[PDB]
């Protein structure tokens, strides 16, 4: 199994696999949105890493087009930095739901969200915290879960 850690918050995201951090971003000016990592399901190696600023218009379309080309079976990791919902439209939301995500489809303004799941298979872990007020953010969430190698 892979030891996977996924952190989502206003100011910082990080992802680690088996003790190696494969993503860390705590910029103010950059990195906003949904960070997406694709792992090889047999080795845990990172095959692709992206960030879609879904706070901004049309970035969710790019995320959908990227997710479309991921082979069924790959491990997906999603994590929000700062804000990932403002221009997250219904098609992207529906796609995340079809990926088995509970909170993705329901993602709201300045919510936090961390997700690990196989494309075409089960979810391995998910956490979500709601912003309590418009000028506030969801509570940071720290998801630590085991991912079985295929």
């Amino acid at each position: 199994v892979l030891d996977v850690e996924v952190y989502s918050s206003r100011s910082k995201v990080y992802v680690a696999v088996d003790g190696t951090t494969v993503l860390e971003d705590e910029a103010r000016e950059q990195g906003r949105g949904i960070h997406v990592i694709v792992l090889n399901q047999a080795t845990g190696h990172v095959m692709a890493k992206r960030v879609f600023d879904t706070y901004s218009p049309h970035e969710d379309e790019a995320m959908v087009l990227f997710l479309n080309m991921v082979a069924p079976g790959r491990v997906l990791i999603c994590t929000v930095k700062d804000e990932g919902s403002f221009h997250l439209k219904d098609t992207a939301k529906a796609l995340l739901r079809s990926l088995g995500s509970q909170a993705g489809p329901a993602l709201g303004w300045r919510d936090t969200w961390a997700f690990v799941g196989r494309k075409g298979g089960p979810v391995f872990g998910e956490k979500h915290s709601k912003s309590p007020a418009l000028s506030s953010w969801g509570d940071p969430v720290l998801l630590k879960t085991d991912v079985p190698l295929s």
Binding site: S56, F86, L134
Partner: peptide, 5 residues
């Protein structure tokens, strides 16, 4: 870049 509200 739009901002609420």
């Amino acid at each position: 870049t739009p901002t609420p509200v």
